[PDB]
Write a protein that binds this DNA or RNA. Structure first.
Lengths: 100, 127, 113, 98, 150
RNA sequence: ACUAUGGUUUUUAUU
RNA sequence: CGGUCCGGCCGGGAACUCAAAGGAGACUGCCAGUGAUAAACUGGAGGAAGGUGGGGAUGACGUCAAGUCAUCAUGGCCCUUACGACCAGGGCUACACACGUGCUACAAUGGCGCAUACAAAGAGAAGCGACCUCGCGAGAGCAAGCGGACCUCAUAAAGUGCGUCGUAGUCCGGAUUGGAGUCUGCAACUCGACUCCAUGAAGUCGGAAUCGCUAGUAAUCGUGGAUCAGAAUGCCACGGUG
RNA sequence: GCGAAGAACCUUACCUGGUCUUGACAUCCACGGAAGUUUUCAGAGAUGAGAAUGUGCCUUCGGGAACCGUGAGACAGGUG
């Protein structure tokens, strides 16, 4: 993935205190159907879906070596080809060829 | 004097002691009558003792652990042969000809990557 | 005899002689026969004359045959003065399943190309 | 009692970390629990063996973690203060509690 | 190619006393369910004696003699090999084939109640009409109509 | 030796 | 071997299990045959096992101007009011038939009710999940224990035992038309997973042809994890009977 | 059972309608605001405005980081 997408990779986590911390008590009740009336809070109802692309709904831990969101080893943060590449140098501590 | 033998079969592991004396059999520090006596042919605890024709001349003590109740008894078959080869030198060949001294490794081995059960490869058709 | 509608055989187990006919339900009929005291297990020989009609106010209750066929044909018929998404696919080889269209649809398309 | 944890990936480094707190103790006549290595942790990985196109051929790798607790009944400045300063041995994690 | 594997054998089982009774944990056994076949061993022969009771010395004297193999056929390719080559079977087949080599209806419309089935097959091998006749008696005419080569 | 038989595939970067 | 809540409970020690592992043993060596009294190959002996024991580990030179600059790496070449960068909605899931890759059934040693046992092997502090209530249930609330061989997922299924179907394209089989719900998400019409109850087709082993297999294998029945609103029959990890 | 372990958008190509052109990922120079809090109107939204309001960290008092804004060249950018 591009370096311009690697700048989006940090813009997507920049709203954590701006939209995703001051209304978290509302976020726990905003869609609960055990409540009076059919409308009670419309002036705050949209404020945590009002931000787009930079939302927890698009947050993914991603390959720390390619920017790809899929097909990577979460214990290393990177894909099969970069585990292979390091194993040919013996470079990952305690990691050794065996099948038991 | 006591004769000794062990046996292994599909996660089951047995050990057996045999003495010259009155005809008894005991298992797992308890009486045999408390969980044996319903087995449909009981060959695995009889046929080596039937080959040497001993009837009631030997006193047996057994310990067994691990796996399923059939393989526990099949593991004891090797214990009642290894503890029985010491009974008389001229019977060492007879238990061997009867197929009781030989063992096999037919129980399944370690998984070969990625083969589902280590002995079959993926299918195909057409050209 | 007379376990379901006017069907004249006195044959089959009490649930199998009542299920998969008249829309009365294949599993509903496994908690209904106790109105007539009829047991799910061991054969019947204590059944009094006309005691079998105790089931009529136990199946209806719910819709039965024609009232179920009308419930099924009513599915698209609550708005008809104006256009609706329920009508055009009802007369096409394209079902309302949200599925990949060019495979596994011959059961909706029928014979010939 | 004072208690320590010695953790490593290498099976001779874990014993080098043991030697600076168990031999240093036996060589002063200090009371010891004796040689106990404890059961070993391991985890397995399956890794694709081509860099390109081939998705079916793969190879396997192991990582094994050794954890010793050694036990201390006569703690000293030459042991419980010295294992937190060990520079001559790389790739080991020492943790201690009072 | 070069395979020379040792031949399989079975020992007489002391619960049934013979080698001919020792194979009904395999003949008409399915899905690896061996103790499910053990459930009906030798009691199936007492159920056969419910249909013709003549004791164990006569229990198989036609129910195997009428159905046992006698010839092995097919061609051998040596030029112009558009014929068949009949050879008489060896004594190691005297009790074989007749309880294994046909399933044409048993896997198609069943073969009646299982606990009664060996008492039916040991009676059908002594009735010798309809099913399993053609696959047996065809080689009693083939080996007389196609025998000019060996 | 060991069955008597079964025809077609555009010229083409060009190594 | 000793003591004794008479119990591995506890001093202490590995009988033999389990997990750690490491070693012995196999060399045609040894007795004979056959042969070019060479190597071989088959019997005998000692062996649990014998003649690469069976399985792993793997892939020498080299072709198809194979595919590939979406795994990288790179020279040249191309776009540059854009083929670059940023945005909203569409689209890629559009469908008149053709074929692989599979999957489920094509019932009656099949189906199910009730009672019972043993494998391995993995996940785990915005996580692994028991208990409890509310409800027909998905679920909504309430919420213990767990920091790993120590504690949640969690009474492996067939087989073992006691019983029951009604002979019928079957209580079979599943494509589907309806009714009513649970929940996420900017939103589920187009383009959703799950829950309860009405309805039910095709299907009875299959044609050229192409196919795995020499035995713990044909057959049959069981256990998790990566991905993580929703999503696979693939992948890797594992067993019981035969 | 393809490159490609999961679909409203996204990883993503393609298309239409908006928006920009030394752009902007990022480096040297320049340069104003704290990040933010309350809140209304247009637009499909990016953007573009209207009305309140905070003055933190750093603070050789000169001047910086966090988070934003905007300008000039050398340039480059590339989901080829």
């Amino acid at each position: 993935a591009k370096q311009s997408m690697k700048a989006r990779e940090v813009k997507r986590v920049a709203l954590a205190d701006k939209y995703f911390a001051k209304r978290a008590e509302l976020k726990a009740i905003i869609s609960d159907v055990n409540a009076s009336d059919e409308d009670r809070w419309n002036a705050v109802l949209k404020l945590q879906t009002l931000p787009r692309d930079s939302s927890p709904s698009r947050q993914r831990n991603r390959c720390r070596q390619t920017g790809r969101p899929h097909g990577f080893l979460r214990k290393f943060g990177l894909s099969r080809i970069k585990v292979r590449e390091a194993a040919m140098r013996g470079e990952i501590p305690g990691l050794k060829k065996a099948s038991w | 004097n006591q004769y000794y033998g062990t046996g292994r079969r599909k996660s089951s592991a047995a050990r057996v002691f045999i003495k010259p004396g009155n005809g008894k059999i005991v298992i797992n520090q308890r009486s045999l009558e408390q969980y044996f006596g319903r087995e449909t042919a009981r060959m695995v605890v009889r046929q080596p003792l039937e080959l040497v024709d001993m009837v009631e001349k030997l006193d047996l003590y057994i310990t067994v652990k691990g796996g399923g109740i059939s393989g526990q008894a099949g593991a004891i078959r090797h214990g009642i042969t290894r503890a029985l080869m010491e009974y008389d030198e001229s019977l060492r060949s007879e238990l061997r000809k009867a197929g009781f001294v030989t063992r096999d490794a037919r129980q399944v081995e370690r998984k070969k990557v990625g083969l589902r059960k280590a002995r079959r490869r993926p299918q195909f058709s057409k050209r | 005899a007379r376990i379901a509608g006017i069907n004249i055989p006195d044959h089959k187990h009490a649930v199998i002689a009542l299920t998969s006919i008249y829309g009365v339900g294949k599993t509903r009929s496994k908690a209904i026969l106790a109105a007539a005291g009829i047991a799910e297990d061991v054969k019947i020989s204590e059944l009094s004359e006309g005691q079998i009609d105790t089931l009529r106010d136990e199946v209806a209750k719910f819709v039965v045959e024609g009232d179920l066929r009308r419930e099924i044909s009513m599915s698209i018929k609550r708005l008809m003065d104006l256009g609706c998404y329920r009508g055009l696919r009802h007369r096409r080889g394209l079902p309302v399943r949200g599925q990949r269209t060019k495979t596994n649809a011959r059961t909706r398309k029928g014979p010939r190309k | 009692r004072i208690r320590i944890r010695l953790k490593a990936f290498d099976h001779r480094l874990i014993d080098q970390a043991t030697a600076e707190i168990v031999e240093t103790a036996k060589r002063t006549g200090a009371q010891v629990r004796g040689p106990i290595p404890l059961p070993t942790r391991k985890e397995r990985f399956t890794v694709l063996i081509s860099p390109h196109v081939n998705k079916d051929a793969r190879d396997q790798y192991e990582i094994r973690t050794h954890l010793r607790l050694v036990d201390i009944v006569e703690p000293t400045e030459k042991t419980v203060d010295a294992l937190m300063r060990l520079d001559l041995a790389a790739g080991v994690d020492v943790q201690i509690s009072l | 190619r070069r395979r020379v594997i040792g031949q399989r054998k079975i020992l007489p089982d002391p619960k049934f006393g013979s080698e001919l009774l020792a194979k009904f944990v395999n003949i008409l056994m399915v899905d690896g369910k061996k103790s499910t076949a053990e459930s009906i061993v030798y009691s199936a022969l007492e159920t056969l004696a419910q249909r013709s009771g003549k004791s164990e010395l006569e229990a198989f004297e036609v129910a195997l003699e009428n159905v046992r193999p006698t010839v092995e056929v097919k061609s051998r390719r040596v030029g112009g090999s558009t014929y068949q080559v009949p050879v008489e079977v060896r004594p190691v087949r005297r009790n074989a084939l007749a309880m294994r080599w046909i399933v044409e209806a048993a896997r198609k419309r069943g073969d009646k109640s299982m606990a009664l089935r060996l008492a039916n097959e040991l009676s059908d091998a002594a009735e010798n009409k309809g099913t399993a006749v053609k696959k047996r008696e065809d080689v009693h005419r083939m080996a007389e109509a196609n025998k000019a080569f060996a």
